[PDB]
Amino acid sequence: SLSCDASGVCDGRSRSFTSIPSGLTAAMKSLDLSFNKITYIGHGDLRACANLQVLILKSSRINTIEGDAFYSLGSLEHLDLSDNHLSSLSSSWFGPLSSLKYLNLMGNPYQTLGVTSLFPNLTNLQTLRIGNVETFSEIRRIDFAGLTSLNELEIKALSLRNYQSQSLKSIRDIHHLTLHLSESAFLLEIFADILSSVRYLELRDTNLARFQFSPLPVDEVSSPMKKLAFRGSVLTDESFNELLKLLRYILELSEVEFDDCTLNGLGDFNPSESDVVSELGKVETVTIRRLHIPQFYLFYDLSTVYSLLEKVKRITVENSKVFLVPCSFSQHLKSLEFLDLSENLMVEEYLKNSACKGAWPSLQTLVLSQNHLRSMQKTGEILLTLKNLTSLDISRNTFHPMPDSCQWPEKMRFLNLSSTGIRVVKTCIPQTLEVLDVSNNNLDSFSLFLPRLQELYISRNKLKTLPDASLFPVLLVMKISRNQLKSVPDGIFDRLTSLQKIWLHTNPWDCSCPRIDYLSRWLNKNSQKEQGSAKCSGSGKPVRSIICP
Ligand SMILES: *[C@@H]1O[C@H](CO)[C@@H](O[C@@H]2O[C@H](CO)[C@@H](O[C@@H]3O[C@H](CO)[C@@H](O)[C@H](O)[C@@H]3O)[C@H](O)[C@H]2NC(C)=O)[C@H](O)[C@H]1NC(C)=O
Ligand SMILES: *[C@@H]1O[C@H](CO)[C@@H](O[C@@H]2O[C@H](CO)[C@@H](O[C@H]3O[C@H](CO)[C@@H](O)[C@H](O)[C@@H]3O)[C@H](O)[C@H]2NC(C)=O)[C@H](O)[C@H]1NC(C)=O
Protein backbone atom coordinates (compact mmCIF):
# COMPACT_ATOMS: atom_id res chain seq x y z
CA SER A 1 0.00 0.00 0.00
CA LEU A 2 3.07 2.24 0.10
CA SER A 3 3.60 4.87 -2.58
CA CYS A 4 6.93 6.14 -3.90
CA ASP A 5 7.70 9.21 -5.98
CA ALA A 6 10.14 9.35 -8.90
CA SER A 7 13.10 9.89 -6.57
CA GLY A 8 12.68 6.71 -4.54
CA VAL A 9 11.06 8.47 -1.58
CA CYS A 10 8.36 6.09 -0.32
CA ASP A 11 5.50 6.78 2.07
CA GLY A 12 4.13 3.92 4.18
CA ARG A 13 3.15 6.07 7.14
CA SER A 14 0.05 5.73 9.33
CA ARG A 15 -1.05 2.55 7.60
CA SER A 16 -2.00 -0.40 9.76
CA PHE A 17 1.12 -2.37 8.88
CA THR A 18 1.79 -5.16 11.38
CA SER A 19 5.06 -6.02 9.66
CA ILE A 20 7.53 -4.47 7.23
CA PRO A 21 5.81 -4.60 3.82
CA SER A 22 7.12 -7.25 1.44
CA GLY A 23 8.55 -6.58 -2.00
CA LEU A 24 10.87 -3.70 -1.10
CA THR A 25 13.42 -2.76 -3.78
CA ALA A 26 16.92 -1.45 -4.43
CA ALA A 27 15.36 1.64 -6.02
CA MET A 28 14.07 2.86 -2.67
CA LYS A 29 16.01 5.78 -1.21
CA SER A 30 13.73 6.78 1.66
CA LEU A 31 11.21 4.72 3.59
CA ASP A 32 8.75 6.17 6.07
CA LEU A 33 7.01 3.43 8.04
CA SER A 34 6.22 5.57 11.08
CA PHE A 35 3.04 5.33 13.15
CA ASN A 36 2.28 1.73 12.23
CA LYS A 37 2.09 -1.38 14.43
CA ILE A 38 5.19 -3.28 13.39
CA THR A 39 5.99 -5.31 16.50
CA TYR A 40 8.81 -7.38 15.00
CA ILE A 41 11.46 -6.82 12.32
CA GLY A 42 12.99 -10.05 11.03
CA HIS A 43 16.23 -11.17 9.40
CA GLY A 44 15.13 -10.51 5.83
CA ASP A 45 12.51 -7.75 5.98
CA LEU A 46 14.97 -5.03 4.93
CA ARG A 47 17.49 -7.06 2.94
CA ALA A 48 16.20 -5.96 -0.49
CA CYS A 49 16.52 -2.19 -0.03
CA ALA A 50 20.31 -2.03 -0.17
CA ASN A 51 20.41 1.58 -1.42
CA LEU A 52 18.12 2.99 1.28
CA GLN A 53 19.40 6.31 2.66
CA VAL A 54 16.54 7.21 5.01
CA LEU A 55 14.54 4.91 7.29
CA ILE A 56 11.90 6.44 9.56
CA LEU A 57 10.25 4.01 11.97
CA LYS A 58 9.03 6.40 14.66
CA SER A 59 6.11 5.45 16.90
CA SER A 60 5.48 2.09 15.36
CA ARG A 61 5.22 -0.57 18.02
CA ILE A 62 8.60 -2.17 17.51
CA ASN A 63 9.69 -4.27 20.46
CA THR A 64 11.90 -6.80 18.67
CA ILE A 65 14.53 -6.41 15.94
CA GLU A 66 16.73 -9.33 14.88
CA GLY A 67 20.43 -8.61 15.28
CA ASP A 68 21.19 -8.67 11.54
CA ALA A 69 18.03 -6.87 10.41
CA PHE A 70 20.07 -3.95 9.00
CA TYR A 71 22.88 -5.98 7.40
CA SER A 72 22.40 -4.59 3.88
CA LEU A 73 21.77 -0.94 4.80
CA GLY A 74 25.38 0.10 4.26
CA SER A 75 24.23 3.32 2.58
CA LEU A 76 21.75 4.34 5.29
CA GLU A 77 22.31 7.88 6.57
CA HIS A 78 19.22 8.50 8.74
CA LEU A 79 17.65 6.02 11.18
CA ASP A 80 14.80 7.09 13.43
CA LEU A 81 13.66 4.42 15.89
CA SER A 82 12.37 6.94 18.42
CA ASP A 83 9.26 6.32 20.52
CA ASN A 84 9.02 2.58 20.02
CA HIS A 85 8.99 -0.25 22.56
CA LEU A 86 12.66 -1.26 22.50
CA SER A 87 13.62 -2.20 26.06
CA SER A 88 16.99 -3.61 25.00
CA LEU A 89 19.47 -2.37 22.37
CA SER A 90 21.74 -4.60 20.30
CA SER A 91 25.19 -3.60 19.04
CA SER A 92 24.55 -5.92 16.07
CA TRP A 93 22.01 -3.51 14.59
CA PHE A 94 24.54 -0.75 14.08
CA GLY A 95 27.61 -2.73 13.05
CA PRO A 96 26.81 -2.51 9.32
CA LEU A 97 25.66 1.13 9.25
CA SER A 98 28.94 2.73 8.13
CA SER A 99 27.20 5.62 6.35
CA LEU A 100 24.93 6.56 9.25
CA LYS A 101 24.85 10.29 10.07
CA TYR A 102 21.67 10.57 12.18
CA LEU A 103 20.44 8.10 14.82
CA ASN A 104 17.46 8.67 17.12
CA LEU A 105 16.85 6.05 19.83
CA MET A 106 15.04 8.37 22.24
CA GLY A 107 11.67 7.48 23.73
CA ASN A 108 12.27 3.73 24.01
CA PRO A 109 11.98 2.07 27.45
CA TYR A 110 15.55 0.77 27.89
CA GLN A 111 17.33 1.31 31.24
CA THR A 112 20.81 1.50 29.72
CA LEU A 113 22.42 1.24 26.30
CA GLY A 114 23.45 -2.31 27.15
CA VAL A 115 26.67 -4.14 28.03
CA THR A 116 28.28 -3.68 24.60
CA SER A 117 29.33 -0.41 22.95
CA LEU A 118 26.70 0.36 20.32
CA PHE A 119 28.41 2.99 18.17
CA PRO A 120 32.07 2.17 17.46
CA ASN A 121 31.29 1.33 13.82
CA LEU A 122 29.39 4.59 13.21
CA THR A 123 32.43 6.59 12.05
CA ASN A 124 30.30 9.14 10.17
CA LEU A 125 27.69 9.79 12.88
CA GLN A 126 26.80 13.47 13.34
CA THR A 127 23.64 13.36 15.49
CA LEU A 128 22.73 10.94 18.29
CA ARG A 129 19.66 11.12 20.54
CA ILE A 130 19.14 8.60 23.38
CA GLY A 131 17.24 8.14 26.62
CA ASN A 132 13.71 8.62 27.89
CA VAL A 133 11.79 10.19 30.78
CA GLU A 134 11.06 7.30 33.15
CA THR A 135 13.52 4.41 32.79
CA PHE A 136 16.95 5.31 31.40
CA SER A 137 18.89 5.17 34.66
CA GLU A 138 22.58 4.59 33.98
CA ILE A 139 25.30 5.95 31.70
CA ARG A 140 28.46 3.84 31.46
CA ARG A 141 32.04 4.30 30.33
CA ILE A 142 31.56 1.88 27.43
CA ASP A 143 28.52 3.77 26.11
CA PHE A 144 30.28 6.19 23.77
CA ALA A 145 33.40 4.25 22.82
CA GLY A 146 34.35 4.75 19.19
CA LEU A 147 32.66 8.13 18.77
CA THR A 148 35.10 10.93 17.98
CA SER A 149 33.07 13.94 16.82
CA LEU A 150 29.36 14.75 16.96
CA ASN A 151 27.44 17.81 15.85
CA GLU A 152 24.62 16.99 18.25
CA LEU A 153 24.33 14.63 21.22
CA GLU A 154 21.08 14.63 23.19
CA ILE A 155 20.73 12.52 26.32
CA LYS A 156 17.37 12.37 28.08
CA ALA A 157 18.13 11.13 31.59
CA LEU A 158 15.50 12.56 33.93
CA SER A 159 15.50 9.30 35.90
CA LEU A 160 19.28 8.84 35.99
CA ARG A 161 20.51 6.83 39.00
CA ASN A 162 24.20 6.69 38.10
CA TYR A 163 26.72 8.29 35.77
CA GLN A 164 30.05 6.46 35.59
CA SER A 165 32.85 9.02 35.74
CA GLN A 166 34.62 9.59 32.41
CA SER A 167 31.79 8.16 30.26
CA LEU A 168 31.56 11.35 28.18
CA LYS A 169 35.32 12.02 28.21
CA SER A 170 36.18 9.74 25.27
CA ILE A 171 34.34 11.97 22.77
CA ARG A 172 36.75 14.45 21.19
CA ASP A 173 34.28 17.09 19.95
CA ILE A 174 30.58 17.81 20.53
CA HIS A 175 29.10 20.92 18.99
CA HIS A 176 25.86 20.79 20.93
CA LEU A 177 25.23 18.61 23.97
CA THR A 178 21.68 18.58 25.32
CA LEU A 179 21.23 16.92 28.71
CA HIS A 180 17.85 16.35 30.33
CA LEU A 181 18.71 15.95 34.03
CA SER A 182 16.24 16.36 36.88
CA GLU A 183 18.82 16.60 39.68
CA SER A 184 22.29 18.14 40.05
CA ALA A 185 23.87 15.07 41.68
CA PHE A 186 26.08 14.18 38.70
CA LEU A 187 26.63 17.65 37.26
CA LEU A 188 30.20 18.06 38.59
CA GLU A 189 31.18 14.63 37.23
CA ILE A 190 29.57 15.24 33.85
CA PHE A 191 30.89 18.79 33.59
CA ALA A 192 34.43 17.54 34.27
CA ASP A 193 34.18 15.03 31.40
CA ILE A 194 33.14 17.54 28.74
CA LEU A 195 35.65 20.34 29.31
CA SER A 196 37.70 19.59 26.19
CA SER A 197 34.87 18.70 23.81
CA VAL A 198 31.58 20.58 24.22
CA ARG A 199 31.07 23.90 22.44
CA TYR A 200 27.44 24.43 23.52
CA LEU A 201 25.96 22.81 26.63
CA GLU A 202 22.20 22.88 27.14
CA LEU A 203 20.79 21.60 30.45
CA ARG A 204 17.05 20.94 30.61
CA ASP A 205 14.68 20.65 33.59
CA THR A 206 17.38 20.47 36.25
CA ASN A 207 16.65 21.24 39.87
CA LEU A 208 19.91 22.95 40.84
CA ALA A 209 18.81 24.13 44.28
CA ARG A 210 21.21 21.67 45.93
CA PHE A 211 24.14 22.26 43.59
CA GLN A 212 27.45 23.01 45.29
CA PHE A 213 30.80 23.67 43.63
CA SER A 214 34.12 21.99 44.40
CA PRO A 215 37.29 22.16 42.30
CA LEU A 216 37.23 19.50 39.58
CA PRO A 217 39.69 16.55 39.65
CA VAL A 218 40.86 17.11 36.08
CA ASP A 219 43.99 18.42 34.42
CA GLU A 220 43.96 22.03 33.23
CA VAL A 221 42.80 22.42 29.63
CA SER A 222 41.46 25.08 27.28
CA SER A 223 37.70 24.49 27.03
CA PRO A 224 35.97 25.12 23.69
CA MET A 225 32.65 25.93 25.38
CA LYS A 226 31.17 29.13 23.94
CA LYS A 227 27.50 28.81 24.93
CA LEU A 228 25.68 27.58 28.02
CA ALA A 229 21.90 27.37 28.39
CA PHE A 230 19.59 26.32 31.22
CA ARG A 231 15.94 25.54 30.37
CA GLY A 232 13.32 25.00 33.08
CA SER A 233 15.80 24.92 35.97
CA VAL A 234 15.19 25.65 39.65
CA LEU A 235 17.91 27.71 41.37
CA THR A 236 18.52 29.43 44.71
CA ASP A 237 20.60 32.59 45.02
CA GLU A 238 23.19 30.43 46.78
CA SER A 239 23.36 27.68 44.15
CA PHE A 240 23.47 30.30 41.40
CA ASN A 241 26.63 31.68 42.98
CA GLU A 242 27.96 28.12 43.10
CA LEU A 243 27.23 27.68 39.39
CA LEU A 244 29.20 30.83 38.54
CA LYS A 245 32.30 29.20 40.04
CA LEU A 246 32.32 26.77 37.10
CA LEU A 247 33.24 29.66 34.79
CA ARG A 248 36.90 29.30 35.77
CA TYR A 249 36.89 26.10 33.68
CA ILE A 250 35.23 27.54 30.57
CA LEU A 251 37.23 30.70 29.92
CA GLU A 252 35.90 31.16 26.36
CA LEU A 253 32.23 31.19 27.39
CA SER A 254 30.61 34.07 25.49
CA GLU A 255 26.88 33.44 25.81
CA VAL A 256 24.56 32.26 28.56
CA GLU A 257 20.80 31.69 28.46
CA PHE A 258 18.21 30.96 31.18
CA ASP A 259 14.73 30.06 29.87
CA ASP A 260 11.71 29.32 32.10
CA CYS A 261 13.79 29.07 35.25
CA THR A 262 12.82 29.82 38.84
CA LEU A 263 15.18 31.49 41.30
CA ASN A 264 14.43 31.12 45.01
CA GLY A 265 15.85 33.57 47.51
CA LEU A 266 17.00 31.55 50.51
CA GLY A 267 16.73 34.43 52.97
CA ASP A 268 19.76 33.38 54.99
CA PHE A 269 22.29 33.46 52.17
CA ASN A 270 24.78 35.96 53.59
CA PRO A 271 28.03 35.21 51.70
CA SER A 272 31.33 36.94 52.41
CA GLU A 273 33.17 38.65 49.55
CA SER A 274 35.44 35.59 49.49
CA ASP A 275 32.91 32.99 48.30
CA VAL A 276 31.11 35.44 46.03
CA VAL A 277 31.83 35.32 42.29
CA SER A 278 32.18 38.83 40.85
CA GLU A 279 33.85 38.23 37.47
CA LEU A 280 32.09 36.94 34.35
CA GLY A 281 35.04 36.31 32.07
CA LYS A 282 34.38 36.87 28.37
CA VAL A 283 30.62 36.43 28.60
CA GLU A 284 29.20 39.16 26.38
CA THR A 285 25.61 37.97 25.84
CA VAL A 286 23.13 37.18 28.61
CA THR A 287 19.61 36.09 27.71
CA ILE A 288 16.88 35.55 30.29
CA ARG A 289 13.33 34.61 29.35
CA ARG A 290 10.37 34.02 31.65
CA LEU A 291 12.31 34.08 34.92
CA HIS A 292 10.23 33.55 38.05
CA ILE A 293 11.51 35.07 41.30
CA PRO A 294 9.03 34.07 44.07
CA GLN A 295 10.14 36.35 46.91
CA PHE A 296 12.65 38.99 45.87
CA TYR A 297 12.75 40.29 49.45
CA LEU A 298 14.76 37.16 50.28
CA PHE A 299 17.92 38.35 48.51
CA TYR A 300 20.86 40.26 50.02
CA ASP A 301 22.44 43.51 48.82
CA LEU A 302 22.77 42.33 45.22
CA SER A 303 25.58 44.70 44.25
CA THR A 304 27.94 41.93 43.15
CA VAL A 305 26.00 41.64 39.90
CA TYR A 306 27.21 45.17 39.14
CA SER A 307 30.78 43.95 38.65
CA LEU A 308 29.46 40.83 36.94
CA LEU A 309 27.92 42.55 33.91
CA GLU A 310 30.41 45.39 33.28
CA LYS A 311 31.72 43.82 30.07
CA VAL A 312 28.44 42.35 28.79
CA LYS A 313 27.42 43.73 25.39
CA ARG A 314 23.93 42.25 24.96
CA ILE A 315 21.31 41.61 27.63
CA THR A 316 17.77 40.31 27.25
CA VAL A 317 15.42 39.97 30.21
CA GLU A 318 12.08 39.08 28.66
CA ASN A 319 8.69 38.48 30.30
CA SER A 320 10.16 38.43 33.81
CA LYS A 321 8.03 41.06 35.57
CA VAL A 322 10.75 43.70 35.49
CA PHE A 323 9.50 47.13 36.57
CA LEU A 324 12.81 48.77 37.36
CA VAL A 325 16.50 48.65 36.46
CA PRO A 326 18.04 50.75 39.24
CA CYS A 327 20.13 53.70 38.06
CA SER A 328 23.35 52.64 39.79
CA PHE A 329 23.07 49.23 38.13
CA SER A 330 22.44 50.79 34.72
CA GLN A 331 25.50 53.03 35.18
CA HIS A 332 27.67 49.95 35.69
CA LEU A 333 26.72 48.36 32.35
CA LYS A 334 29.41 50.35 30.56
CA SER A 335 29.84 47.99 27.60
CA LEU A 336 26.15 47.28 26.96
CA GLU A 337 25.11 47.90 23.34
CA PHE A 338 21.80 46.01 23.14
CA LEU A 339 19.12 45.80 25.86
CA ASP A 340 15.81 43.97 25.38
CA LEU A 341 13.23 44.28 28.17
CA SER A 342 10.24 43.02 26.15
CA GLU A 343 7.03 41.95 27.92
CA ASN A 344 7.71 43.49 31.29
CA LEU A 345 6.13 46.13 33.55
CA MET A 346 8.04 49.30 32.65
CA VAL A 347 6.23 52.63 33.01
CA GLU A 348 7.72 56.07 32.39
CA GLU A 349 8.38 57.06 36.03
CA TYR A 350 10.57 54.02 36.61
CA LEU A 351 12.14 54.10 33.14
CA LYS A 352 13.31 57.59 34.13
CA ASN A 353 15.38 56.08 36.95
CA SER A 354 16.50 53.14 34.79
CA ALA A 355 17.72 55.49 32.07
CA CYS A 356 19.36 58.03 34.37
CA LYS A 357 22.09 60.50 33.34
CA GLY A 358 24.91 58.03 32.73
CA ALA A 359 22.88 54.84 32.28
CA TRP A 360 23.77 52.32 29.57
CA PRO A 361 26.49 54.70 28.20
CA SER A 362 27.28 52.66 25.10
CA LEU A 363 23.69 51.60 24.34
CA GLN A 364 22.75 51.55 20.65
CA THR A 365 19.58 49.43 20.70
CA LEU A 366 16.79 49.47 23.27
CA VAL A 367 13.73 47.20 23.06
CA LEU A 368 10.81 48.09 25.36
CA SER A 369 8.20 46.33 23.24
CA GLN A 370 5.38 44.89 25.36
CA ASN A 371 5.45 47.08 28.48
CA HIS A 372 3.23 49.71 30.13
CA LEU A 373 4.38 52.94 28.47
CA ARG A 374 1.58 55.46 27.78
CA SER A 375 3.24 58.58 26.39
CA MET A 376 5.59 58.73 23.39
CA GLN A 377 6.56 62.31 24.21
CA LYS A 378 7.50 61.48 27.80
CA THR A 379 9.31 58.31 26.70
CA GLY A 380 11.41 60.14 24.12
CA GLU A 381 12.25 62.87 26.65
CA ILE A 382 13.34 60.32 29.24
CA LEU A 383 15.62 58.56 26.76
CA LEU A 384 17.56 61.72 25.85
CA THR A 385 20.11 60.46 28.38
CA LEU A 386 21.11 57.72 25.91
CA LYS A 387 23.39 59.71 23.61
CA ASN A 388 24.46 56.79 21.40
CA LEU A 389 21.02 55.21 20.91
CA THR A 390 20.31 54.51 17.25
CA SER A 391 17.39 52.06 17.46
CA LEU A 392 14.29 52.09 19.68
CA ASP A 393 11.46 49.54 19.77
CA ILE A 394 8.38 50.63 21.74
CA SER A 395 5.91 48.46 19.87
CA ARG A 396 3.02 46.78 21.64
CA ASN A 397 2.64 49.60 24.18
CA THR A 398 -0.75 51.32 24.43
CA PHE A 399 0.11 54.94 23.68
CA HIS A 400 -2.15 57.97 23.92
CA PRO A 401 -2.11 60.15 20.77
CA MET A 402 1.31 61.61 19.94
CA PRO A 403 1.82 65.41 19.81
CA ASP A 404 3.30 67.56 17.04
CA SER A 405 6.58 68.15 18.88
CA CYS A 406 8.83 65.55 20.49
CA GLN A 407 12.45 65.25 21.58
CA TRP A 408 14.29 61.99 20.77
CA PRO A 409 17.90 60.73 20.94
CA GLU A 410 19.72 62.57 18.14
CA LYS A 411 21.16 59.48 16.45
CA MET A 412 17.89 57.52 16.44
CA ARG A 413 17.41 56.07 12.94
CA PHE A 414 15.12 53.13 13.72
CA LEU A 415 11.76 53.44 15.50
CA ASN A 416 9.23 50.64 15.95
CA LEU A 417 5.70 51.85 16.79
CA SER A 418 3.95 48.69 15.64
CA SER A 419 0.77 47.75 17.52
CA THR A 420 0.59 50.92 19.61
CA GLY A 421 -3.00 51.77 18.77
CA ILE A 422 -2.14 55.08 17.12
CA ARG A 423 -4.74 56.64 14.81
CA VAL A 424 -2.55 59.38 13.34
CA VAL A 425 1.16 60.01 12.76
CA LYS A 426 2.43 63.51 13.54
CA THR A 427 5.73 65.37 13.41
CA CYS A 428 6.56 63.84 16.81
CA ILE A 429 8.31 61.26 14.61
CA PRO A 430 11.76 62.71 13.66
CA GLN A 431 13.13 63.26 10.14
CA THR A 432 16.33 61.50 11.21
CA LEU A 433 14.50 58.20 10.70
CA GLU A 434 15.73 55.64 8.19
CA VAL A 435 13.36 52.89 9.39
CA LEU A 436 9.81 53.33 10.67
CA ASP A 437 7.36 50.61 11.60
CA VAL A 438 3.78 51.75 12.20
CA SER A 439 2.13 48.49 11.22
CA ASN A 440 -0.86 46.95 12.97
CA ASN A 441 -2.35 50.26 14.09
CA ASN A 442 -5.50 52.26 13.25
CA LEU A 443 -4.09 54.63 10.61
CA ASP A 444 -6.33 55.97 7.84
CA SER A 445 -3.50 57.84 6.11
CA PHE A 446 0.21 58.74 6.21
CA SER A 447 1.41 62.21 5.20
CA LEU A 448 4.74 62.54 6.99
CA PHE A 449 7.71 63.68 4.90
CA LEU A 450 10.66 61.53 6.01
CA PRO A 451 13.48 62.40 3.53
CA ARG A 452 15.92 59.76 4.78
CA LEU A 453 13.43 56.91 5.17
CA GLN A 454 14.63 53.63 3.67
CA GLU A 455 11.94 51.36 5.10
CA LEU A 456 8.28 51.96 5.93
CA TYR A 457 6.15 49.19 7.42
CA ILE A 458 2.49 50.23 7.53
CA SER A 459 0.77 46.89 6.94
CA ARG A 460 -2.45 46.07 8.78
CA ASN A 461 -3.94 49.56 8.93
CA LYS A 462 -6.92 51.23 7.26
CA LEU A 463 -5.35 53.19 4.42
CA LYS A 464 -7.63 53.61 1.41
CA THR A 465 -5.04 55.65 -0.42
CA LEU A 466 -1.38 54.85 -0.95
CA PRO A 467 0.78 57.51 0.71
CA ASP A 468 2.28 60.04 -1.72
CA ALA A 469 5.44 58.77 -3.45
CA SER A 470 7.13 62.14 -2.94
CA LEU A 471 7.16 61.51 0.82
CA PHE A 472 9.95 58.93 0.52
CA PRO A 473 12.47 59.83 -2.23
CA VAL A 474 14.99 57.17 -1.20
CA LEU A 475 12.66 54.43 0.04
CA LEU A 476 13.98 50.89 -0.38
CA VAL A 477 11.18 48.91 1.28
CA MET A 478 7.45 49.53 1.61
CA LYS A 479 5.11 47.14 3.41
CA ILE A 480 1.47 48.05 2.97
CA SER A 481 -0.36 44.75 2.88
CA ARG A 482 -3.66 44.22 4.71
CA ASN A 483 -5.04 47.73 4.30
CA GLN A 484 -8.03 48.82 2.20
CA LEU A 485 -6.33 49.84 -1.03
CA LYS A 486 -8.49 49.42 -4.13
CA SER A 487 -6.23 51.25 -6.58
CA VAL A 488 -3.06 53.32 -6.97
CA PRO A 489 -2.28 56.52 -8.92
CA ASP A 490 -0.83 55.85 -12.38
CA GLY A 491 2.96 55.70 -12.38
CA ILE A 492 3.34 55.90 -8.60
CA PHE A 493 5.67 52.94 -8.07
CA ASP A 494 8.02 54.13 -10.81
CA ARG A 495 8.45 57.24 -8.66
CA LEU A 496 9.90 55.13 -5.82
CA THR A 497 13.25 55.20 -7.60
CA SER A 498 15.17 53.19 -4.99
CA LEU A 499 12.44 50.63 -4.28
CA GLN A 500 13.78 47.11 -3.82
CA LYS A 501 10.88 45.32 -2.11
CA ILE A 502 7.16 45.91 -1.69
CA TRP A 503 4.32 44.06 0.06
CA LEU A 504 0.95 44.80 -1.59
CA HIS A 505 -0.99 41.65 -0.75
CA THR A 506 -4.25 41.29 1.17
CA ASN A 507 -5.78 44.49 -0.21
CA PRO A 508 -9.16 44.73 -2.02
CA TRP A 509 -7.67 45.55 -5.43
CA ASP A 510 -10.29 46.62 -7.98
CA CYS A 511 -9.28 44.75 -11.12
CA SER A 512 -11.74 46.44 -13.48
CA CYS A 513 -9.63 47.11 -16.57
CA PRO A 514 -10.05 50.78 -17.29
CA ARG A 515 -8.34 51.20 -13.91
CA ILE A 516 -6.07 48.27 -12.97
CA ASP A 517 -3.95 48.65 -16.13
CA TYR A 518 -0.93 50.43 -14.60
CA LEU A 519 -0.71 48.27 -11.47
CA SER A 520 -1.05 44.98 -13.35
CA ARG A 521 1.61 46.10 -15.86
CA TRP A 522 3.96 47.33 -13.13
CA LEU A 523 3.68 44.04 -11.25
CA ASN A 524 4.55 42.16 -14.45
CA LYS A 525 7.71 44.21 -14.98
CA ASN A 526 8.71 44.14 -11.31
CA SER A 527 7.93 40.60 -10.15
CA GLN A 528 11.28 40.50 -8.33
CA LYS A 529 10.25 43.40 -6.09
CA GLU A 530 6.86 42.05 -4.99
CA GLN A 531 6.69 40.01 -1.79
CA GLY A 532 3.59 37.82 -1.77
CA SER A 533 0.99 38.24 -4.51
CA ALA A 534 -1.58 41.00 -4.85
CA LYS A 535 -4.99 39.51 -5.67
CA CYS A 536 -8.19 40.91 -7.14
CA SER A 537 -11.10 41.57 -4.79
CA GLY A 538 -13.74 38.89 -5.23
CA SER A 539 -12.29 36.56 -7.86
CA GLY A 540 -9.03 36.18 -5.94
CA LYS A 541 -7.18 36.19 -9.26
CA PRO A 542 -3.59 37.53 -9.18
CA VAL A 543 -3.47 41.21 -10.15
CA ARG A 544 -0.56 40.47 -12.50
CA SER A 545 -2.72 38.07 -14.53
CA ILE A 546 -4.98 40.91 -15.62
CA ILE A 547 -4.29 42.33 -19.09
CA CYS A 548 -6.16 45.46 -20.20
CA PRO A 549 -6.53 46.11 -23.94
C1 LIG B 1 28.29 57.36 24.10
O1 LIG B 1 27.89 58.73 24.04
C2 LIG B 1 28.73 59.58 24.85
C3 LIG B 1 28.16 60.98 24.75
O2 LIG B 1 28.34 61.69 25.97
C4 LIG B 1 30.20 59.53 24.36
O3 LIG B 1 31.05 60.21 25.32
C5 LIG B 1 31.44 61.52 25.04
O4 LIG B 1 32.49 61.48 24.07
C6 LIG B 1 32.88 62.80 23.63
C7 LIG B 1 33.88 62.62 22.52
O5 LIG B 1 34.81 61.59 22.83
C8 LIG B 1 33.46 63.62 24.80
O6 LIG B 1 33.63 64.99 24.38
C9 LIG B 1 34.90 65.56 24.45
O7 LIG B 1 34.91 66.45 25.58
C10 LIG B 1 36.18 67.12 25.76
C11 LIG B 1 36.09 67.93 27.03
O8 LIG B 1 37.09 67.54 27.96
C12 LIG B 1 36.49 68.00 24.54
O9 LIG B 1 37.76 68.61 24.70
C13 LIG B 1 36.48 67.15 23.27
O10 LIG B 1 36.62 68.00 22.13
C14 LIG B 1 35.17 66.35 23.16
O11 LIG B 1 34.10 67.24 22.90
C15 LIG B 1 32.53 63.59 26.03
O12 LIG B 1 33.24 64.06 27.17
C16 LIG B 1 31.96 62.18 26.32
N1 LIG B 1 30.86 62.29 27.27
C17 LIG B 1 31.05 61.99 28.55
C18 LIG B 1 30.93 60.53 28.95
O13 LIG B 1 31.30 62.84 29.40
C19 LIG B 1 30.69 58.08 24.21
O14 LIG B 1 31.92 58.07 23.50
C20 LIG B 1 29.67 57.20 23.47
N2 LIG B 1 30.06 55.81 23.54
C21 LIG B 1 30.35 55.14 22.43
C22 LIG B 1 31.35 53.99 22.56
O15 LIG B 1 29.86 55.41 21.34
C1 LIG C 1 8.48 45.84 15.21
O1 LIG C 1 8.02 45.10 16.34
C2 LIG C 1 7.14 44.03 15.96
C3 LIG C 1 6.49 43.52 17.22
O2 LIG C 1 7.42 42.76 17.99
C4 LIG C 1 7.93 42.98 15.15
O3 LIG C 1 7.07 41.86 14.78
C5 LIG C 1 7.20 40.68 15.51
O4 LIG C 1 8.45 40.07 15.18
C6 LIG C 1 8.72 38.90 15.99
C7 LIG C 1 10.12 38.43 15.62
O5 LIG C 1 10.09 37.56 14.50
C8 LIG C 1 7.66 37.81 15.76
O6 LIG C 1 7.86 36.72 16.70
C9 LIG C 1 7.54 35.43 16.26
O7 LIG C 1 8.60 34.52 16.64
C10 LIG C 1 8.71 34.31 18.07
C11 LIG C 1 9.88 33.36 18.29
O8 LIG C 1 9.82 32.25 17.40
C12 LIG C 1 7.41 33.73 18.62
O9 LIG C 1 7.53 33.52 20.02
C13 LIG C 1 6.26 34.70 18.34
O10 LIG C 1 5.03 34.14 18.79
C14 LIG C 1 6.18 34.98 16.83
O11 LIG C 1 5.75 33.80 16.16
C15 LIG C 1 6.24 38.39 15.94
O12 LIG C 1 5.28 37.44 15.47
C16 LIG C 1 6.06 39.72 15.18
N1 LIG C 1 4.79 40.32 15.53
C17 LIG C 1 3.93 40.65 14.57
C18 LIG C 1 2.68 39.79 14.43
O13 LIG C 1 4.11 41.60 13.81
C19 LIG C 1 8.47 43.67 13.89
O14 LIG C 1 9.29 42.77 13.15
C20 LIG C 1 9.27 44.94 14.26
N2 LIG C 1 9.57 45.69 13.05
C21 LIG C 1 10.81 45.74 12.58
C22 LIG C 1 11.01 46.44 11.25
O15 LIG C 1 11.77 45.24 13.17
Ligand SMILES: *[C@@H]1O[C@H](CO)[C@@H](O)[C@H](O)[C@H]1NC(C)=O
Ligand atom coordinates in the same frame (compact mmCIF):
# COMPACT_ATOMS: atom_id res chain seq x y z
C1 LIG D 1 32.52 -2.81 13.18
O1 LIG D 1 32.39 -3.88 12.22
C2 LIG D 1 33.64 -4.52 11.90
C3 LIG D 1 33.34 -5.51 10.79
O2 LIG D 1 34.54 -6.00 10.20
C4 LIG D 1 34.21 -5.19 13.14
O3 LIG D 1 35.44 -5.83 12.83
C5 LIG D 1 34.42 -4.15 14.24
O4 LIG D 1 34.82 -4.80 15.43
C6 LIG D 1 33.13 -3.35 14.49
N1 LIG D 1 33.39 -2.24 15.40
C7 LIG D 1 34.63 -1.76 15.56
C8 LIG D 1 35.36 -2.13 16.84
O5 LIG D 1 35.17 -1.03 14.73
